[PDB]
Design an enzyme around this catalytic site. Structure first.
Site, mmCIF file in Angstrom:
data_model
loop_
_atom_site.group_PDB
_atom_site.id
_atom_site.type_symbol
_atom_site.label_atom_id
_atom_site.label_comp_id
_atom_site.label_asym_id
_atom_site.label_seq_id
_atom_site.Cartn_x
_atom_site.Cartn_y
_atom_site.Cartn_z
ATOM 1 C CG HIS B 97 -2.309 0.548 0.866
ATOM 2 N ND1 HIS B 97 -3.366 0.468 1.745
ATOM 3 C CD2 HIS B 97 -2.775 1.197 -0.225
ATOM 4 C CE1 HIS B 97 -4.425 1.043 1.209
ATOM 5 N NE2 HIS B 97 -4.093 1.495 0.015
ATOM 6 C CG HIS B 122 -3.977 -1.814 9.364
ATOM 7 N ND1 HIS B 122 -4.279 -2.736 8.381
ATOM 8 C CD2 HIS B 122 -3.534 -2.530 10.426
ATOM 9 C CE1 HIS B 122 -4.033 -3.953 8.830
ATOM 10 N NE2 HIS B 122 -3.581 -3.856 10.068
ATOM 11 C CG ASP B 124 -2.279 1.963 5.783
ATOM 12 O OD1 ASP B 124 -2.551 1.504 4.658
ATOM 13 O OD2 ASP B 124 -2.091 1.243 6.791
ATOM 14 C CG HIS B 137 2.692 -1.609 4.469
ATOM 15 N ND1 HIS B 137 2.076 -2.841 4.392
ATOM 16 C CD2 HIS B 137 3.189 -1.515 5.725
ATOM 17 C CE1 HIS B 137 2.197 -3.466 5.549
ATOM 18 N NE2 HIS B 137 2.869 -2.682 6.374
ATOM 19 C CG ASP B 228 -4.920 -3.386 2.639
ATOM 20 O OD1 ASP B 228 -4.838 -4.548 2.185
ATOM 21 O OD2 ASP B 228 -4.231 -2.986 3.601
ATOM 22 C CG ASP B 230 -5.250 -5.378 5.540
ATOM 23 O OD1 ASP B 230 -6.069 -4.438 5.665
ATOM 24 O OD2 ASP B 230 -4.033 -5.227 5.724
ATOM 25 C CD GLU B 273 -0.327 -4.216 1.636
ATOM 26 O OE1 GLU B 273 0.364 -5.247 1.699
ATOM 27 O OE2 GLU B 273 0.152 -3.079 1.810
HETATM 28 MN MN LIG Z 1 -3.195 -0.645 3.926
HETATM 29 MN MN LIG Z 2 -4.355 -2.809 6.201
#
Ligand SMILES: [Mn+2]
Ligand SMILES: [Mn+2]
Ligand SMILES: [Mn+2]
Ligand SMILES: [Mn+2]
Ligand SMILES: [Mn+2]
Ligand SMILES: [Mn+2]
Lengths: 314, 314, 314
Positions: B97, B122, B124, B137, B228, B230, B273
């Site tokens: 990322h 997250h 980020d 990232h 992302d 995740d 990711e």
């Molecule tokens: Mn990310």
């Molecule tokens: Mn993340």
């Protein structure tokens, strides 16, 4: 800040399976104390309650191990009362749910105006006369409710009990496996509940809104959250004695408790029925305990959106 | 119809794990181009960006591989700007990322009035001074925000950067693992966000309603969706570096993007990711990539209710 | 109380896979009859329909096994009509979904004012001219709708059919894999539907509210619920021929039907596409069938909040 008073309650005689006794141990070996300390939490550990051995504890009618269960609850209740008099939120890391009888009782002795949020797949409101199994972990709420007085027989080991909360001061969340008699009691005592059907219908958000206003609408009283790990789906907490499919989500379990935290009115909390010996695999034990820890930390501040201390991070 | 401009970005130096580089490859071997062509999509592939090798890239304070990351982002940004000047929706099939820094920047150069929807577990938004890991990232948003100017040190390889979006033009969806400093930044810069707690509370439907009006209320500006993998639960996208339990559903991920599609305002999109090398099994790699493809196709028209061309099928 | 009339329909020629024939068998070996008897259910089993063998059943254009499928449906329809004339709720434990043609038809002969709730991942509204596969389990709704008259060719074995329900009397719930032509038909015939996108948006609660008022707003007519096990997610009902990811939850499936039950207007019910031979493992067969049984029992009273007879349990 909210202070905690860990009460380790290693008891299993409320049901057949024994590995529930090693619950306080697995939860501590997970890091519960340390994790709570990383937050703005003041933790004082009152150790594990060394519950005695009562070999001469034959059944009462069909009620199993009454003296042991009644004695463990009488023991737990004083400690809970002790920590509460210590101005600390009692955290009962237990085994089976029969320990709730002593937890709510002990808590009510110091805070008679308490409200109870009971998260579970079952209502645990069977009486010694309506129960089919005899396991007292499915009977706690009936020993505690004032209206159900006169309907519970004199169970050896429970004479010390005095119904402390009335049917109006408790809310169930997560129901999906309730017996015929228990259901009769719910509709007859007018107990507010949010079974999985109402969670599906209204959403976890609405459910909490209604449960908090239902209990704190008139005044702002202490809240006792009795959390049974099997209220959550068996995909999140598999290592438990009585798992029922279609449970509360990991997310819903965290939402439940983040909201409870946010009322700032939590005073009593039970995290029960985690039996590491019932794991199909070693990771199932891990998934159960970790989920148990996560919900505990949310009862004391851990928020998914984030947390930061009152300082200038930049 | 919406035209696409695939920008393959095989980069991993934004974090430790290297298998994220082979992401554009696994996504293409899945059939992304072909699948997009079955729809009313005009696809032009700008190939994979051949990111150079910078051997002399020692840490800056604690910030890792800055010149490589800063150079890959400077490279990505021009291509994104290129495709946008080509009147095509840039599709950055990336690795980590950190590439977002160059993606949003490149996009903003041609469309300075862009809005960003950041789907992730997250935020980020760590700065080179608030980060504990050093992996860039987990720092992209801080390099991009104008208000966080003066709080990010001169990271070798990022001099070319100029904060392009202000804290008011971005919305996060899916948060559940945000650091103390990042949270401070969110509340201080007044960033609108929808962590998993708000998704649980309001529902995925309400969340999108609010995010789209939040960004398109005043005018109808281009939308940059930085996705992302995740942000989704680790049961749907397991092959990722930083998975966190209790994520967005497969359904929620599709709902997020079908709604984005429906605004007809998508201009920038990142699918990052996906690390096939982090799969526990071969099917975990498959479940991750397939979910990645599915969300991409929904950003470009694929609707669950169905799709049909403007013709008389009977 | 609601009386049931089990119609075992062991048929598979509506698609390629044959293990769907042993569905009535696996569902009965699960205990469906006995479980229904534990409730306030009056059950009369009309056995399994012994569907004949038609060896000379070559394709019609691209339509496969038409005479067998048309004959099994003509056979099923009379039994359904029989049980309905018997004042009993017909429970068709089937194989593939082509049997719906005979189920809704048979039901409509006795109750022409019936309403249909079609739970599925697919709309099964392809005509012999729009279908690409030829499997008639993906074509039932087109043989049943009056408006689609003149668009379905004379399929040998279906001459007996007479379109009975109009596009206005049916609601789909759970869609996510609908062909281009089927979608054209939906938008053109103005069929109300709730694909997974609308479930995500509005919630399962709102969806049911709207589906029940949509069908019972004007009057209170009989309800025919045609339930295809693949409407549910493949994590709950894996043993099925055409599984599609991102399905209805175990919870949503139970919510759907508890609400249907609660209208007290259920008259027709189909539980189809359970193929124990498609289980990856023995427990997948178990998870599929058990979920199938659970949804059946909810169509007839089993509620998650609890159930009790009209008596004083205390
Ligand atoms: Mn990310
Ligand atoms: Mn993340
Ligand atoms: Mn319990
Ligand atoms: Mn329970
Ligand atoms: Mn079907
Ligand atoms: Mn289907």
């Amino acid at each position: 800040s909210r202070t905690i008073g860990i009460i380790g309650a290693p008891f299993s005689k409320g049901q057949p399976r024994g590995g529930v006794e090693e619950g306080p141990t697995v939860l501590r070996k997970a890091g519960l104390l340390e994790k709570l300390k990383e937050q703005e939490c003041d933790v004082k550990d009152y150790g594990d309650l060394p519950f005695a051995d009562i070999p001469n504890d034959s059944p009462f009618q069909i009620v199993k191990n009454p003296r042991s269960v009644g004695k463990a609850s009488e023991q737990l209740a004083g400690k809970v009362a002790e920590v509460k008099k210590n101005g600390r939120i009692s955290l009962v890391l237990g085994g089976d749910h029969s320990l709730a009888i002593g937890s709510i009782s002990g808590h009510a002795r110091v805070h008679p105006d308490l409200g109870v949020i009971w998260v579970d797949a079952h209502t645990d409101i069977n009486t010694p006369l309506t129960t089919t199994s005899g396991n007292l972990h499915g009977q706690p709420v009936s020993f505690l409710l004032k209206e159900l007085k006169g309907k519970i027989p004199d169970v050896p080991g429970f004479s010390w009990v005095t119904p402390c909360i009335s049917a109006k001061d408790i809310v169930y969340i997560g129901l999906r496996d309730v017996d015929p008699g228990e259901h009769y009691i719910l509709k007859t005592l007018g107990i507010k509940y949010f079974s999985m059907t109402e969670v599906d219908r209204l959403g976890i958000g609405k459910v909490m809104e209604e449960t908090l206003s239902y209990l704190l609408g008139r005044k702002k009283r202490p809240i006792h959250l009795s959390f049974d790990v099997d209220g959550l789906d068996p995909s999140f907490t598999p290592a438990t004695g009585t798992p029922v499919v279609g449970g509360l989500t990991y997310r819903e379990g965290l939402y439940i408790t983040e909201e409870i935290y946010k009322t700032g009115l939590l005073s009593g909390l039970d995290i029960m029925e985690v039996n590491p010996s019932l794991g199909k695999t070693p990771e199932e034990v891990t998934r159960t305990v970790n989920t148990a820890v996560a919900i505990t930390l949310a009862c004391f501040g851990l928020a998914r959106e984030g947390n930061h201390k009152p300082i200038d991070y930049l």
